[PDB]
C-alpha cells in the first residue's frame, strides 16, 4: 500500500 500512495512524490 504505502508504494501505491508515495507514487504521488
Known amino acids: ?3 501505491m500512495l508515495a ?3
Open 1 to 3: 500500500l504505502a508504494a
Open 7 to 9: 507514487q504521488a512524490l
